[PDB]
Amino acid sequence: KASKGRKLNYSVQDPIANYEAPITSGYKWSDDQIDEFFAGLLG
Amino acid sequence: GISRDSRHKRSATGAKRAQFRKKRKFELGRQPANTKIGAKRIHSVRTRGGNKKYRALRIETGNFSWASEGISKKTRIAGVVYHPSNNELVRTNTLTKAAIVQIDATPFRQWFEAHYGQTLRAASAKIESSVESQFSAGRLYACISSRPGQSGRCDGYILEGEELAFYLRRL
Amino acid sequence: ESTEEVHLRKMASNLRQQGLKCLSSVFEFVGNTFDWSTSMEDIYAVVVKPRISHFSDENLQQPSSLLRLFLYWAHNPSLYQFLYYDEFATATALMDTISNQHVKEAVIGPIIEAADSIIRNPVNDDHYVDLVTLICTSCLKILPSLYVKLSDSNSISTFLNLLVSITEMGFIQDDHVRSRLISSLISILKDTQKILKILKLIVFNYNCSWSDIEELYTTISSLFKTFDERNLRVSLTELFIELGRKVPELESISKLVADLNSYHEYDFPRILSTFKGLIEDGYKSYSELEWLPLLFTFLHFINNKEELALRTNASHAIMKFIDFINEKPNLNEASKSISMLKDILLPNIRIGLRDSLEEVQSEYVSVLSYMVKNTKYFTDFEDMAILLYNGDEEADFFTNVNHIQLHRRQRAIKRLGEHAHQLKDNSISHYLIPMIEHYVFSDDERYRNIGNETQIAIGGLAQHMSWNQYKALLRRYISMLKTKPNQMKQAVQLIVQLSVPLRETLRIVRTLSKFPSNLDEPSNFIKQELYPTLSKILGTRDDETIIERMPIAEALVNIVLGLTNDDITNFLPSILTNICQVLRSKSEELRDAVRVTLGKIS
Amino acid sequence: KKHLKRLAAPHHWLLDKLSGCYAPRPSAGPHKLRESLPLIVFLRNRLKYALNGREVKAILMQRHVKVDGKVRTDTTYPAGFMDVITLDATNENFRLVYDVKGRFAVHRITDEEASYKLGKVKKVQLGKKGVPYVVTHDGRTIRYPDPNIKVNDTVKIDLASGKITDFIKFDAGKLVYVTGGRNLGRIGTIVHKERHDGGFDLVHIKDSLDNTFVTRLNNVFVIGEQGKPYISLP
Amino acid sequence: VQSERAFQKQPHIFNNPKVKTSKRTKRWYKNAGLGFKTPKTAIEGSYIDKKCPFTGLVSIRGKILTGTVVSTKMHRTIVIRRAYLHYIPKYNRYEKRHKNVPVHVSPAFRVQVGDIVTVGQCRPISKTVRFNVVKVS
RNA sequence: AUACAGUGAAACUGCGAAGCUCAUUAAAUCAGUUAUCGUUUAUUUGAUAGUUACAUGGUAUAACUGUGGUAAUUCUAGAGCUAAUACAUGCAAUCUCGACCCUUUGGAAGAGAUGUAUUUAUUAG
RNA sequence: AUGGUAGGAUAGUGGCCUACCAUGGUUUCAACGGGUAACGGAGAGGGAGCCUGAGAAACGG
């Protein structure tokens, strides 16, 4: 089952580490605004 | 990138074998030709020697054989219904040998009328009930026996008898 | 066109060939759907009419497009007007193809089916009645010749289909038609139910004189023993019942034969009563022609194994015929009875002696015993009577060989082997060896002591035996070595037992009956058949049966020495080295087998 | 590879090991490299007619040499077993037969003997259009063979027409030439064929001196009946 | 027989539904030679096995070996063990060794753990299987 | 040589282009031997294809002529030629069964039959 | 990783790879791992990729 990758493996993979860096700016709308709008998502 | 060497694999006793040498082209392997329904597209690929292979990337036509009455007609392929190996090919309607497909019953229908003079002498005109139902529906089940990815052809034969019943239960 | 325009003539021939196919092809496909009434005359006048005159000679080999057109016209009632045109020229043309000497089977089959279809397809017009009469008369006159030409079983069947169609249609009403249909039928004899049904209709409806049906009666009498399935028998008995009705002489016999063969199960009280009837002077009354179906039935009952009363009575029923031969005042009328004894009973006795079943064999062994004991007019079994010593018991060998006590069987077979020299060669090969050889291959524990002495007895018997039969006896056993794995040991020992009688034949000539004067001819037979075949079997590498093939080497050292001294030097080295090649084998037990065999050889 | 050292050259050619750096490689042709004698070796080192490769080229270019009745101009043509070499200028005809030691011997033959050769039937099978044919040890494809001809039989081929004149079945008592192994070049009569299916079939052969030896079937070549060879032996 | 997603059938062997001459489906079989009797269960069996020496597209050629069955747990193949006495010249003495060979077994043969099987070499069937069972005892 | 015909630059076709320096690896290198009924194979060699034509087109250009750009290359654009084993196109026969058994090798009415390559199906083997 | 079924690709066999299924395979008769007078296999500035041809993943492009 683990063989051939049929099972997800949660170990580190070195080549993919630090391929990209997160953007610290984040979403344009503030976190509280996003939380509010999801709570009302689709009524 | 695709290679056919057995060196990369693990041993029978099981030592993780080390790379002897760089990949050679005389164990070369090529990508899967995911044949699919539609306007014919075939590519010519140069193989070892002067031999040539045809890569049916797209095909909507095939020469399918009615083995019982011993004919073979060229018919449109409707789509893939069942493939024993993997269902994703059925979902993607990938065309490969042993794939169960739906084919044109019109030429077979006309041929039957011509040769037996009966809609669909009488004893010969009699055939299996399930295939009669398939013609009445207008869609015929068939199994591909040719390899579109090597010869560039999607030939096949009409399912009948035990094979037809088995695939019907599988469907 | 003149012969000069060769190219133009060739293309015209192609157009005629292609078009004539075109007429047949279109007319096969849409023959029934389209109405041709307007074009009946135009098609007939321009196509068929120019070619009717010669049509016989062209279409002899294989079916043609024009011929295929006529056949469909014959098949389909609506299209008979083609046949009606011009005094039935096309129908006459079809008959002319049949009448031709060089007509081949491929064209007969389609015609004869077409003629049958017309007979079966009545049509309400005057032309049809004339048509069927012409077809029937031409067909019936020539049927026996066509059958001989036929080479396909289906082609036989379609013929017989037409014959039954004739009976149902009622052309057999006429005497001449009846005679011709009989002449065709006896050719078929000279599927089966259809014959019997055809015979039943022609025979039941009409009286026949005894001379006409005597030959039919004898063959159909023989069909009793050949036939085994119940449907075959009941139909066969029904014919004999009717064979009785027409001719008062046979009414008694057919009445007997019917009560001999009763069905599904046989009526045991009645058949036994019939057996009491024949034994108590009824056998005296029966005439020579009466015996036949009684005999053929008797040979069937004795062949039976399930019911004890039937085979016992049947065996004694055969014994009544032997008494009937004795009752005959002299040899002349006895000879006519003896001829049947030689033709019918003796072949079926001999195969009966080779029958596997013991209870079945014992009846035949009883049958032969009575013949040897009573030999007033049948003298072929005189040699056996010498073995019998006037039929004295414990001396006859007939009671001992099938005795309940096995030691009595074994003591008797040695005595027979000792006295083989007095016995005549043909009897030794045809009757005696068949009765004893089954002991050799018997599998039971109880019969092995009998089997070993039987091998000695057969060896002595083969010593006093004919060259031609003795050859066939050898060749059969060599075939058994290859064909039968379980009987190899029994075969090889018996072959060694048959080597020695050939041996004691060959030293004094440099004994066997009718031995050839010249030693070269027997010598060659050994050089190309016996020595090679036995040697290659000996040299085969199958360690499972290596022990079983060792006595072959004894047979090899046998067959060589009486061959010429030059031949001796040729073959012993190959034989004896093979003995050595098994001697070198590591197995101690096998090596001991080589040592003793090499000793006996020595 | 494409170059051959003299030290690596086949032993049976008889070639001296110190003559030069390199030896002739037989070209592609009827016979295998290890079982062929190139015409350069045959003509220069056995016949001594030529003194180096250049006179060999001149001779072959004069078309004075015929192999199996046809002119050869290739210096390294692979002549082999049962090959007929004709030199019309010298009126000489040779057949290549191994000696007892296992080397080609330059055996002179008469014109009639040169007219025919013998080929062991390697294969019997029908080609296209249902035409039977036989493939011999020298690669000759001969169509319409006699039905009785089977594998391991020997066919007498007429060089002029390339047709089978006669044939010999493979059977005990037949006269046989050894074409491989330690017994190479020996002649003897068959005694027995030891059949190992799925393996190498072995044949026992007895010489005129009654000595017996065993050899694989692939090294067997029927050449005639005992005491009646179809060829003049060396 | 039909325990797989695909339909199992002998390639190029046809049973005509219309003709229906015989109830039994037409079965193709061959004798492997080498004096190995083709078993009757293979002749009248209903299994489909592409690697069977009598009904599959595999030919027995080359070495013929014998061994003792050691494992029969996997599908249509087994593991056999062959032992021998190897010679050591320095001590001039023999030592026992063994080797395990995986061999294909057709369903026409019933093999347990401990019996003796004679096997025939054939083309590469799998990563490790080069042989095929041809006689059981 | 009144189509050219010897030799022949250039160009288009055809064939062939398949020593050094670093690392190191225990029967996984290598050597012997088996099988390919599980495969490809230039070339050599033996066989092997009866299914407008007194010879078609540029659907064509190189070399070549000539006009130019660029510091500039095995860098180059425009215009005008002309060919093939380069590129495309393409064309009144034979063999059987053989009545008549006419003549008795023989002619012969009539019936017929007749590429290869790929893929699938089917039959014989 | 051991094997079966089916598929993809090769010049073709084959887990070589892919979809499902069984938990298998070697080993104290030495698997696996370590050392070595095991000179007693790799690349053409460095990795990735493509093209020709019968034969090269080409000391070519």
PDB file of C-alpha atoms in Angstrom, chain D residues 7 24 128-129 170 174 179 225:
ATOM      1  CA  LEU D   7      46.976 -14.359 -32.408  1.00  0.00           C
ATOM      2  CA  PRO D  24      42.149 -11.300 -42.694  1.00  0.00           C
ATOM      3  CA  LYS D 128       5.198 -17.904 -49.586  1.00  0.00           C
ATOM      4  CA  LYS D 129       2.544 -19.219 -51.993  1.00  0.00           C
ATOM      5  CA  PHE D 170      20.207 -39.594 -41.783  1.00  0.00           C
ATOM      6  CA  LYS D 174      25.464 -44.054 -42.881  1.00  0.00           C
ATOM      7  CA  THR D 179      32.424 -30.878 -38.625  1.00  0.00           C
ATOM      8  CA  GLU D 225      26.949 -44.940 -47.210  1.00  0.00           C
TER       9      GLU D 225
END
